[PDB]
């Protein structure tokens, strides 16, 4: 059955779009953390959280690529059986 592979490819790309959209929606807040005070502890906390947000965005961009390569494989594998007639 090739039509199921096409359906999965469509849902994977939808899921990818959600991951990408939620990351982008909240990035202005997660990367805008400021130290609540001028001491070094407050700075170490805010700096950690900004970098932690930034590395999360990279991790998600990488996950978006894994999902798109998965949808592509699903579509390519579906066109291997729908024309194999």
């Amino acid at each position: 059955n090739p039509e199921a592979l096409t359906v999965a490819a469509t849902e994977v790309r939808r899921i990818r779009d959600r991951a990408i959209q939620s990351d982008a929606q909240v990035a202005p807040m997660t990367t805008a953390v400021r130290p609540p005070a001028a001491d070094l502890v407050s700075e170490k906390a805010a700096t950690f959280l900004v970098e932690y947000a930034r590395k999360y965005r990279q991790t998600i961009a990488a996950a978006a690529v894994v999902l798109e390569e998965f949808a592509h494989a699903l579509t390519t594998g579906a066109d291997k059986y729908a024309t194999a007639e």
């Binding site: 359906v7 959600r18 991951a19 609540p36 005070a37 407050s42 959280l49 991790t59 996950a63």
Partner: protein, 174 residues
């Protein structure tokens, strides 16, 4: 970070200045929505794979799940980490609020110094010398108290951050 080496004017002024924890609280609400959204992503992904396994249930698909497993477990691990971020940001905000509260107010420090100079300005006959030394001990007490408050603040913040483990790269599927 050995803040006990800095005088109370420094530690007290540093914690009282700044914009407060609002930007931290806004980020906790944001991280918390990511947790909600990515739990939905994880649930939809598992469901997508199970529907495909149901609509064909053959060797071709059973091998796609095997090549997908590493990503699926990665996605589970990501959900656990996401749920921790908001919790630890609020632990940090509380640490800051307790540091702010327990730190000696600058006014007390200024008043100590001001009272000391009034005794100096009237110590020609030396009969306030001992009370001057008492005021020096109180200032050292302020120094010690601020050092203790920053110690505990650093340790609470250090513990909260230690629980935010590094994001790992997602494995490939195809």
């Amino acid at each position: 970070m050995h803040f006990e080496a800095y005088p109370p004017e420094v530690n007290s002024a540093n914690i009282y200045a700044g914009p407060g924890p609002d930007s931290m609280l806004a980020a906790a609400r944001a991280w918390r929505s990511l947790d909600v959204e990515m739990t939905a992503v994880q649930r939809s992904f598992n469901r997508t794979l199970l529907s495909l396994m149901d609509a064909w249930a053959g060797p071709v698909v059973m091998q796609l799940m095997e090549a997908a497993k590493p990503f699926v477990r990665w996605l589970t691990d990501l959900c656990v980490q996401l749920s921790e971020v908001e919790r630890q940001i609020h632990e940090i905000v509380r640490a800051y609020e307790w540091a702010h509260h327990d730190m000696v107010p600058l006014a007390q420090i200024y008043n100590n110094r001001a009272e000391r100079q009034i005794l100096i300005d009237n110590n020609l006959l030396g009969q306030f010398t001992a009370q001057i030394a008492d005021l020096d001990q109180e200032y050292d007490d302020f120094w010690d108290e601020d050092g203790e408050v920053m110690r505990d603040y650093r340790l609470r913040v250090s513990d909260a951050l230690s629980k935010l483990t590094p994001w790992k790269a997602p494995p490939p599927i195809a």
